[PDB]
Design an enzyme around this catalytic site. Structure first.
Site, PDB file in Angstrom:
ATOM      1  N   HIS A 277       3.907   7.421   3.893  1.00  0.00           N
ATOM      2  CA  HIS A 277       2.604   7.245   4.519  1.00  0.00           C
ATOM      3  C   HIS A 277       1.821   8.531   4.396  1.00  0.00           C
ATOM      4  CE1 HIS A 277       3.258   3.277   6.422  1.00  0.00           C
ATOM      5  NE2 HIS A 277       4.519   3.670   6.497  1.00  0.00           N
TER       6      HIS A 277
ATOM      7  N   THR B 249       4.499  -0.314  11.673  1.00  0.00           N
ATOM      8  CA  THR B 249       3.133   0.179  11.594  1.00  0.00           C
ATOM      9  C   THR B 249       2.265  -0.547  10.567  1.00  0.00           C
ATOM     10  OG1 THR B 249       3.711   1.887   9.982  1.00  0.00           O
ATOM     11  CG2 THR B 249       3.851   2.473  12.320  1.00  0.00           C
TER      12      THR B 249
ATOM     13  N   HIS C 106       0.788  -1.238   0.000  1.00  0.00           N
ATOM     14  CA  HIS C 106       0.000   0.000   0.000  1.00  0.00           C
ATOM     15  C   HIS C 106       0.819   1.287   0.000  1.00  0.00           C
ATOM     16  CE1 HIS C 106      -3.695  -2.251   0.397  1.00  0.00           C
ATOM     17  NE2 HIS C 106      -3.172  -2.928   1.402  1.00  0.00           N
TER      18      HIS C 106
ATOM     19  N   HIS D 200      10.014   4.711   2.350  1.00  0.00           N
ATOM     20  CA  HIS D 200       8.646   4.617   1.824  1.00  0.00           C
ATOM     21  C   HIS D 200       7.744   5.647   2.507  1.00  0.00           C
ATOM     22  CE1 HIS D 200       8.272   1.924   5.377  1.00  0.00           C
ATOM     23  NE2 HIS D 200       7.038   2.393   5.409  1.00  0.00           N
TER      24      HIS D 200
ATOM     25  N   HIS E 168       9.256   6.991   5.906  1.00  0.00           N
ATOM     26  CA  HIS E 168       9.931   6.101   6.828  1.00  0.00           C
ATOM     27  C   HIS E 168      11.232   5.653   6.186  1.00  0.00           C
ATOM     28  CE1 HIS E 168       6.127   4.755   9.275  1.00  0.00           C
ATOM     29  NE2 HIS E 168       6.375   6.049   9.373  1.00  0.00           N
TER      30      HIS E 168
HETATM   31 CL   LIG Z   1       5.026   8.584  10.572  1.00  0.00          CL
HETATM   32 ZN   LIG Z   2       6.144   2.566   7.397  1.00  0.00          ZN
END
Ligand SMILES: [Cl-]
Ligand SMILES: [Zn+2]
Ligand SMILES: [Cl-]
Ligand SMILES: [Zn+2]
Lengths: 226, 226
Positions: free
Chosen positions: A91, A170, A64, A89, A108
Site C-alpha cells: 500500500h 482495508t 490496485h 501486498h 500487508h
Molecule cells: Cl498499513
Molecule cells: Zn491490504
C-alpha cells in the site's frame, strides 16, 4: 469497479457498489485508523513466526496492489494456532497511522487459520537504503513466471513491537473480524525501489482513508520473529 | 417479537425479524463471549464515574429483562467523553463468561455519549449476602410509580478490575461499536433476592448464547469508582 479516486467508485461510495461491500460503511471496526490511544502490558508473547524462504505462487497486479501470493507453507502462530500466509501486498502510502505519522509504503502480510479467521500484519517502510528482500518481488512482477525465492524469514527484524487490535480489511469487501498486527519499526526501501513499486501500482495511491474509530481497544505488544 | 426461545423469534433468527437486526448475524464482534485471553495492564485507568443516588424514571419488565431507566444525570467519563447512563437491567444467567465460569445473574449499565457511541458495564452476582442496593429495584418493579432512589454510587466497589474490549449489544439490534467493561469480582445477592429477580423476569432465562469470537483483543485493567 471500486478504486481509490473521489468519483463514483471511490472509498466514500464502496458500500454502494455491491451489497457485499455495505459493511465498508456500516461496520463499527473499519480499518485503517490512527493508532494513538493504546495500552501496555508485561505479558509474555502469544505470537510466533514460521516463515521460510519461498518461491511465490504468483507475483502480479490485482485489486490496485502489487501482490506476491504463496503456496500454503508459511505460518504465523497466534494463541497457539497456525494461520497460513496467503500473500504479501503493498500500500502506498501506508494505511495505518501511528500517532498521526505516515510512511510512504507498507506491506500487508495476510493470513488465515483453518477456521477462516483473518490475521494481517502491517509494516511500514521508510525511504533509505536498498532493501534486498524486495528484489525478488520487483524482479518477479516484470517476469513471466519462474519467480525467485522471497526471503520471508529475513524480511522482518528480529524483535518487533506492534499495535494489536480488531479491525477490518482495508479494501472491499471490508470484512471485519480481522486481528491486526501493526509493526512499529519501519523497514528500509531505497528511493529507486520505492518509485519502482509505486509504478507497478500504476502511480495511483491505494491507501484507504482513515475510518471512524469506535473506541478501538489497542494493546502494544512485542514478539521475536526468530 | 424477538425472544430467547428457539422457535421463529429466537437468537439464531434475530437477524431475519427486521433488517435493523441483521448485524446480529453478520457482525464479527458479537457479544457475549468467553473471556479467557486477555492482556494485563498495570496502570490505573483514567476512567471516571459520575454516579449518584437516582430515582428511576421507570422500573419495568421490557424485552425479557427487568429494567430501571434513569434521567440523564449519571455518566461514565471515558477517553474524555461523558457516556450518559440510560438504564440498568438484568440477565439470568450472566451472559459473559470469564475463563468458562458462569454467574447466575448480571447487571448491564447501558451508556451512550453525545456523539452516539455505546459503553456498557457488566457486573455479575454470586449468591451470598443480601444486597441492599437491589432492594429499590425489587420494590420498584412491584410499584405503580414513585420509585425510590437507586444507589448507583454504592452499587460497585471502590476498586474494580475489569475486562475491556470492543463488542456488541447482547440483544437486538445487536449494534456493534460497544465499549465493554466487564467487572471481574462479582457482587453479592441473597438466594431469596436471586429467586425474586428471576421470577420478575418470568423465570425465563434471558441469556444470549456465546457468539463466535474472531480473536477479540481484551485488556485487563484496574480502576477506581471514586
Ligand atoms: Cl498499513
Ligand atoms: Zn491490504
Ligand atoms: Cl453479562
Ligand atoms: Zn443487556
Amino acid at each position: 469497479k471500486w478504486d481509490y479516486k473521489n468519483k463514483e467508485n471511490g472509498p466514500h461510495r464502496w458500500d454502494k457498489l455491491h451489497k457485499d461491500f455495505e459493511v465498508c460503511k456500516s461496520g463499527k471496526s473499519q480499518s485503517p485508523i490512527n493508532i494513538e490511544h493504546y495500552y501496555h502490558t508485561q505479558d509474555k508473547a502469544d505470537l510466533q513466526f514460521k516463515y521460510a524462504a519461498s518461491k511465490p505462487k504468483a507475483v502480479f497486479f490485482t485489486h490496485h496492489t502489487l501482490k506476491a501470493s504463496f503456496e500454503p507453507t508459511n505460518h504465523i502462530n497466534y494463541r497457539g494456532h497456525d494461520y497460513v500466509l496467503d500473500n504479501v501486498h503493498f500500500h502506498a502510502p501506508m494505511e495505518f497511522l501511528i500517532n498521526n505519522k505516515t510512511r510512504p509504503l507498507s506491506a500487508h502480510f495476510v493470513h488465515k487459520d483453518a477456521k477462516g479467521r483473518l490475521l494481517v500484519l502491517a509494516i511500514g517502510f521508510e525511504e533509505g537504503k536498498e532493501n534486498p528482500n524486495l528484489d525478488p518481488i520487483l524482479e518477479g512482477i516484470q517476469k513471466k513466471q519462474n519467480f525467485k525465492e522471497v526471503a520471508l524469514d529475513a524480511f522482518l527484524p528480529k524483535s518487533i513491537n506492534y499495535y494489536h487490535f480488531n479491525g477490518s480489511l482495508t479494501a472491499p469487501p471490508c470484512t471485519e473480524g480481522v486481528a491486526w498486527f501493526v509493526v512499529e519499526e519501519p523497514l528500509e526501501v531505497s528511493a529507486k525501489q520505492l518509485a519502482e513499486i509505486k509504478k507497478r501500482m500504476k502511480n495511483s495511491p491505494n491507501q484507504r482513508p482513515v475510518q471512524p474509530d469506535y473506541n478501538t481497544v489497542i494493546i502494544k505488544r512485542s514478539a521475536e520473529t526468530r
